[PDB]
Design an enzyme around this catalytic site. Structure first.
Site, short mmCIF file in Angstrom:
data_model
loop_
_atom_site.label_atom_id
_atom_site.label_comp_id
_atom_site.label_asym_id
_atom_site.label_seq_id
_atom_site.Cartn_x
_atom_site.Cartn_y
_atom_site.Cartn_z
N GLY C 10 0.79 -1.22 0.00
CA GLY C 10 0.00 0.00 0.00
C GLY C 10 0.84 1.29 0.00
O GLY C 10 2.09 1.26 0.05
N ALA C 12 1.33 3.65 2.42
CA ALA C 12 2.11 3.89 3.61
C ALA C 12 3.30 2.97 3.63
O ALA C 12 4.45 3.45 3.86
CB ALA C 12 1.27 3.74 4.85
N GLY C 143 -5.89 1.64 5.31
CA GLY C 143 -6.16 1.51 3.89
C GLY C 143 -6.78 0.16 3.52
O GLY C 143 -6.67 -0.81 4.27
N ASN C 206 0.49 7.15 14.11
CA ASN C 206 0.75 8.32 13.31
C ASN C 206 0.59 9.59 14.15
O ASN C 206 1.26 10.55 13.93
CB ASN C 206 -0.19 8.36 12.09
CG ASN C 206 0.50 7.91 10.82
OD1 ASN C 206 1.70 7.66 10.79
ND2 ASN C 206 -0.26 7.81 9.75
N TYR C 224 3.87 13.55 5.33
CA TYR C 224 4.19 12.12 5.28
C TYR C 224 5.67 11.92 5.21
O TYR C 224 6.20 11.00 5.81
CB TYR C 224 3.51 11.42 4.08
CG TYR C 224 2.07 11.10 4.34
CD1 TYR C 224 1.65 10.75 5.63
CD2 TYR C 224 1.12 11.14 3.31
CE1 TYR C 224 0.32 10.41 5.88
CE2 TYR C 224 -0.21 10.82 3.55
CZ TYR C 224 -0.59 10.47 4.85
OH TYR C 224 -1.89 10.18 5.11
N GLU C 254 16.92 -12.71 19.51
CA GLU C 254 17.21 -12.78 20.92
C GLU C 254 16.37 -11.82 21.78
O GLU C 254 15.90 -12.21 22.83
CB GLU C 254 18.68 -12.57 21.13
CG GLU C 254 19.22 -13.19 22.39
CD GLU C 254 20.70 -13.33 22.30
OE1 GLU C 254 21.15 -14.08 21.41
OE2 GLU C 254 21.43 -12.67 23.10
N1 LIG Z 1 3.14 7.38 8.29
C1 LIG Z 1 2.56 7.31 7.05
N2 LIG Z 1 1.25 6.99 6.97
C2 LIG Z 1 0.60 6.94 5.82
C3 LIG Z 1 1.32 7.22 4.62
N3 LIG Z 1 0.44 7.10 3.60
C4 LIG Z 1 -0.78 6.77 4.13
N4 LIG Z 1 -0.66 6.66 5.47
C5 LIG Z 1 -1.69 6.29 6.46
O1 LIG Z 1 -2.31 5.09 5.97
C6 LIG Z 1 -3.70 5.11 6.16
C7 LIG Z 1 -4.37 5.00 4.82
O2 LIG Z 1 -3.90 3.88 4.14
P1 LIG Z 1 -3.11 3.95 2.73
O3 LIG Z 1 -1.78 3.30 2.83
O4 LIG Z 1 -3.02 5.36 2.31
O5 LIG Z 1 -4.09 3.11 1.79
P2 LIG Z 1 -3.65 1.95 0.76
O6 LIG Z 1 -2.90 0.89 1.40
O7 LIG Z 1 -2.91 2.48 -0.44
O8 LIG Z 1 -5.12 1.33 0.42
P3 LIG Z 1 -6.09 1.89 -0.76
O9 LIG Z 1 -5.45 3.10 -1.40
O10 LIG Z 1 -7.46 2.10 -0.20
O11 LIG Z 1 -6.18 0.77 -1.75
C8 LIG Z 1 -4.02 6.44 6.76
O12 LIG Z 1 -4.10 6.28 8.17
C9 LIG Z 1 -2.81 7.30 6.43
O13 LIG Z 1 -2.57 8.24 7.44
C10 LIG Z 1 2.72 7.54 4.75
O14 LIG Z 1 3.40 7.76 3.76
N5 LIG Z 1 3.30 7.59 5.96
#
Ligand SMILES: Nc1nc2c(ncn2[C@@H]2O[C@H](COP(=O)(O)OP(=O)(O)OP(=O)(O)O)[C@@H](O)[C@H]2O)c(=O)[nH]1
Ligand SMILES: Nc1nc2c(ncn2[C@@H]2O[C@H](COP(=O)(O)OP(=O)(O)O)[C@@H](O)[C@H]2O)c(=O)[nH]1
Ligand SMILES: [Ca+2]
Ligand SMILES: [Mg+2]
Ligand SMILES: [Mg+2]
EC number: 3.6.5.-
Lengths: 421, 68, 440
Positions: C10, C12, C143, C206, C224, C254
């Site tokens: 995804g 993040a 996500g 976060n 981000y 460990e």
């Molecule tokens: N720390 C951090 N959190 C992130 C980032 N991108 C998204 N998030 C967090 O991830 C959550 C959303 O999920 P995403 O990763 O954006 O969604 P995805 O996995 O791409 O899933 P879909 O786009 O719905 O298919 C939210 O809580 C965001 O705050 C990032 O680059 N860094």
């Protein structure tokens, strides 16, 4: 690579459609000949959501223009950007709708429908990945309402896993080109409750009152209203058209905006009709709503808000937090974090700072009540009905639609009264 | 007696890694099966509703014809 | 030997992976084209950095990684970006359409269309390994892809690799950076589904990272990129044992032995120090005692909870840089006098220590001081359960009205999966309660 397919149907639909295209073409740096003469990479990054690439490296709207009479459509060609459309996507008949819903839905609309369908297919099959559809129309006429809804249904059979999104224009007896308009409206709503994923409720009542009582136009034109409609439409598609840290598309928006399938009718808002706090306050003010409902007569289930301009991210966060804090009674507690915020660096033409607001609020019931009151006044003394059975319709179908709409009001009320504990 | 206990322990560890893998594999297949079923039934019901609306639009055109 | 494979899933997961792999390249002196002038072993080796990096004949050092997302916009930037020569195109896997914040689409509808190909690419990474040790899986809770697809994948990996170890870096949602109202749903479903397939999972709140970026680095409104840059320093601290070696160095496994007293209780609390700007660090060496001290400050935790109101089941200290044991032992002695760190009656009270001699770096253009020494504490405390409670509370408020549930049912899920996941979480909260109660 996330295509939307746009459809304008009937008089209102084609005019607001045309305006839409004008506004966004200007925002994206596209001329009436369809050439990119613009200044930023950002205008092109998600350009194919609305435009196809072409021969002579042109950009062509993915739009389909539809009407039961050539009137409004030739004005579309004659108008500027009339040249940017694809001449095959003009699908028109002759006999017209005669402001009669049964004509749009069952008779003449039904004769024209398949040619629209064929162009829809030509447009979908060229898509790398189809988000779905947006239809601009009115619910007071006959083409827009009746044939727009028939279209929706037919498209739904062929793309039942795509999102259907409408911009639907609601009839007010101020600016009011008929008398059967409640029948037409109720009939359309009945369809909409079942077959759209998301409907932007654009109310002429609210548009009129903004122009009159606020903008000071004692005699407001269709042009004045549609100015409002176009600023709004720009506003609510900003997150589709430009790259953000949100990635919006119609599905994600529906998912975050629609907690129960039927309750998908939105109250749009705009500001200015200037500082972040003022922007934020005005934007939630009942006076800036594009649907004629007071949000303090209901509660918000969900809200999306987008700020356009260069401004402090920190300040907007503070203002939006503030607005939820200080008005906490007007947001349901059983949907945590139900207010979302986006910022776009690029303002619309002619402003330094705007704000667009999309609400799923139970105060929208007010609007469905208005249509319900008018509708029933006629119907029960069976006034003007022959017009409808004229085409093969039963009385039952009028009863069913009124019920459905009263059911929708009942439902909005039920979630308004609901508590966490 | 001790060697045979040694054999038992290690065969038990194999057996458990295996029953875990197996269980997982089955659990997945059942859920994906039930998933496809359900999703299909939702689409089918949607299409059925649409098609009833088509049929109804015949009975509205066929019925206007029967006023002549 | 002893290789680890990283899977980033995804948005993040991917962006965090950009951050982590950039940092690793810099920690090891690997250039953006993959060359590393210092490795005399061409086309392979068995140095410690080879746990995370494979070598080719041309001298390119290639992450043992796969990036996976259900749409292409985020990985495209990797394909196009500065580090694009690092990966073979097959390690970067995209579909066309995302999960739309929906766990069902992630686990089933969209995700099942790409799972085989992902497992196939992962298998090509595993075939290059002489003694594969396990997986590192990066993803968000909130996500549709990060929840659903990660779940599906973990189940499949248990199937295809058995009880081979799988560790998580899981991104727990905060309202400031949130993208969907349905994140508590996706969070609960993915936690319930993955619980039996995961060996150790590090939650990264976060909101905590966000708070830390605001407070210690005076970043008005963190991005981000800010978050990720800090997170990666934490992940680097945690993986330094695998990637480097020295005499005082102590392997993650460990620590893992001490960290997980029961299979379900596998969620350690991380705390990092120092987080400080260049401005504030200029003319201040922060000693072992100060960074050690700051590890016990709740404002330095990855997760917002109050360990003072729970009990300790384990306490580990992972140092890197200019650090010798004498100092550590002094610092710990002072902490033990000045704090009452309380353990459950069934475990010993020692702190487990490890030291990696290699000093931290930073990524140029960043806001973090380049310091001489650092530390991540990993503790296992019952307080982490607060983070389950908050999420569970949010789930309940929506679920009691069945809000948004139709989006999941539309994809072929049943309400039963929801109640079943929420019951699992309730039982996990109760487990966390029980481990802290004193023995007969
Ligand atoms: N720390 C951090 N959190 C992130 C980032 N991108 C998204 N998030 C967090 O991830 C959550 C959303 O999920 P995403 O990763 O954006 O969604 P995805 O996995 O791409 O899933 P879909 O786009 O719905 O298919 C939210 O809580 C965001 O705050 C990032 O680059 N860094
Ligand atoms: N805001 C707005 N409303 C319009 C416009 N044109 C028509 N309407 C409204 O449309 C309703 C009648 O529908 P119309 O589009 O004229 O009929 P159709 O061509 O059969 O769809 C009435 O309530 C009008 O007030 C327009 O340009 N702007
Ligand atoms: Ca100083
Ligand atoms: Mg008209
Ligand atoms: Mg995504």
């Amino acid at each position: 690579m996330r295509e939307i397919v746009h459809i304008q149907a009937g008089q209102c639909g084609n005019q607001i459609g045309a305006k839409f295209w004008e506004v966004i073409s200007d925002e994206h740096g596209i001329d009436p000949t369809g050439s990119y003469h613009g200044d930023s990479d950002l205008q092109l990054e998600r350009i194919n959501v609305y435009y196809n690439e072409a021969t002579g490296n042109k950009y062509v709207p993915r739009a389909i223009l539809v009407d039961l009479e050539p009137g409004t459509m030739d004005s579309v060609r004659s108008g500027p950007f009339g040249q940017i459309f694809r001449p095959d996507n003009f699908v028109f008949g002759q006999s017209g709708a005669g402001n009669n819903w049964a004509k749009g839905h069952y008779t003449e609309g039904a004769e024209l429908v398949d040619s629209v369908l064929d162009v829809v297919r030509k447009e979908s099959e060229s898509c790398d990945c189809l988000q779905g559809f947006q239809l601009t129309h009115s619910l007071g006429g006959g083409t827009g309402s009746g044939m727009g809804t028939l279209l929706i249904s037919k498209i739904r059979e062929e793309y039942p896993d795509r999102i259907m999104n409408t911009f639907s224009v609601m009839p007010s007896p101020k600016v009011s080109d008929t008398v059967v308009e409640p029948y037409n409206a109720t009939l359309s709503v009945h369809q909409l409750v079942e077959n759209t994923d998301e409907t932007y409720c654009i109310d002429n009542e609210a548009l009129y009152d903004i122009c009159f009582r606020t903008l000071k136009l004692t005699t407001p034109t269709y042009g004045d209203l549609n100015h409002l409609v176009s600023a709004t439409m720009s506003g609510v598609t900003t997150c589709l058209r430009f790259p953000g840290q949100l990635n919006a598309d119609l599905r994600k928006l529906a998912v975050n905006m629609v907690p129960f399938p039927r309750l998908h009718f939105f109250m749009p808002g705009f500001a200015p009709l200037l500082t972040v706090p003022e922007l934020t306050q005005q934007m939630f003010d009942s006076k800036n709503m594009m649907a004629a409902c007071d949000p303090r007569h209901g509660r918000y289930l969900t809200v999306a808000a987008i700020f356009r301009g260069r401004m402090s991210m920190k300040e907007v966060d503070e203002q939006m937090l503030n607005v939820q804090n200080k008005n906490s009674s007007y947001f349901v507690e059983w949907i945590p974090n139900n207010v979302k915020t986006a910022v776009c660096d690029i303002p619309p033409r002619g402003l330094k700072m705007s704000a667009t607001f999309i609400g799923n609020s139970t105060a929208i019931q007010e609007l469905f009540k208005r249509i319900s009151e008018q509708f029933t006044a006629m119907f029960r003394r069976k006034a003007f009905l022959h017009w409808y059975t004229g085409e093969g319709m039963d009385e039952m179908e009028f009863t069913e639609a009124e019920s459905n709409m009263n059911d929708l009001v009942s439902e909005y009320q039920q979630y308004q009264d609901a508590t966490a504990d | 007696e001790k060697r045979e206990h040694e054999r038992e322990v290690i065969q038990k560890a194999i057996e458990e890694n295996n029953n875990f893998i197996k269980m997982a594999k089955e659990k997945l297949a059942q859920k994906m099966e039930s998933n496809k079923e359900n999703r299909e039934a939702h689409l089918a019901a949607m299409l059925e509703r649409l098609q009833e609306k088509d049929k109804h639009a015949e009975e509205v055109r066929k019925n206007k014809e029967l006023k002549e | 030997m002893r290789e680890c494979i990283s899977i980033h899933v995804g948005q993040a997961g991917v962006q965090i992976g950009n951050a982590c792999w950039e940092l690793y390249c810099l920690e090891h002196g690997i250039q953006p084209d993959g060359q590393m002038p210092s490795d005399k072993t061409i086309g392979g080796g068995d140095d410690s950095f080879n746990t995370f990096f494979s070598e080719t004949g041309a001298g390119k050092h290639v992450p043992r990684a796969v990036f996976v997302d259900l749409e292409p916009t985020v990985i495209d930037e990797v394909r196009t970006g500065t580090y694009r020569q690092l990966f073979h195109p097959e390690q970067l896997i995209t579909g066309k359409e995302d999960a739309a914040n929906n766990y069902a689409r992630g686990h089933y509808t969209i995700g099942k269309e790409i799972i085989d190909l992902v497992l196939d690419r992962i298998r090509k990474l595993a075939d290059q390994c002489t003694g594969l040790q396990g997986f590192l899986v990066f993803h968000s809770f909130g996500g549709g892809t990060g929840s659903g697809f990660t779940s599906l994948l973990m189940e499949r990996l248990s199937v295809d690799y058995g009880k081979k170890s799988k560790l998580e870096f899981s991104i727990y949602p905060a309202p400031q950076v949130s993208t969907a109202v349905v994140e508590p749903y996706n969070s609960i479903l993915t936690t319930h589904t993955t619980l039996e397939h995961s060996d150790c999972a590090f939650m990264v709140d976060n909101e905590a990272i966000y708070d830390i970026c605001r407070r210690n680095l005076d970043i008005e409104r963190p991005t981000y990129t800010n978050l990720n840059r800090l997170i990666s320093q934490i992940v680097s601290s945690i993986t330094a044992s695998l990637r480097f070696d020295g005499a005082l160095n102590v392997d993650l496994t460990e620590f893992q032995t001490n960290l997980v007293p029961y299979p379900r209780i596998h969620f350690p609390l991380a705390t990092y120090a120092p987080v400080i700007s260049a401005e504030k660090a200029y003319h201040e060496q922060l000693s072992v005692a100060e960074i050690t001290n700051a590890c016990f400050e709740p404002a330095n935790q990855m997760v917002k909870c109050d360990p003072r109101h729970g009990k300790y089941m384990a306490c580990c200290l992972l140092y890197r840089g200019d650090v010798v044991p004498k100092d550590v032992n002094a610092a710990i002695a002072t902490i033990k006098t000045k704090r009452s760190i309380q353990f459950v009656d069934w475990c010993p009270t020692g702190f487990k220590v490890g030291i990696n001699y290699q000093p931290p770096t930073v990524v140029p253009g960043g806001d973090l001081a380049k310091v001489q020494r650092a530390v991540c504490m990993l503790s296992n405390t019952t307080a982490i359960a607060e983070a389950w409670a908050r999420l569970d509370h949010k789930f309940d408020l929506m679920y009691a009205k069945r809000a948004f549930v139709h989006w999941y049912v539309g994809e072929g899920m049943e309400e039963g999966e929801f109640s079943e996941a929420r019951e699992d979480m309730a039982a996990l909260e109760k487990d966390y309660e029980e481990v802290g109660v004193d023995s007969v």
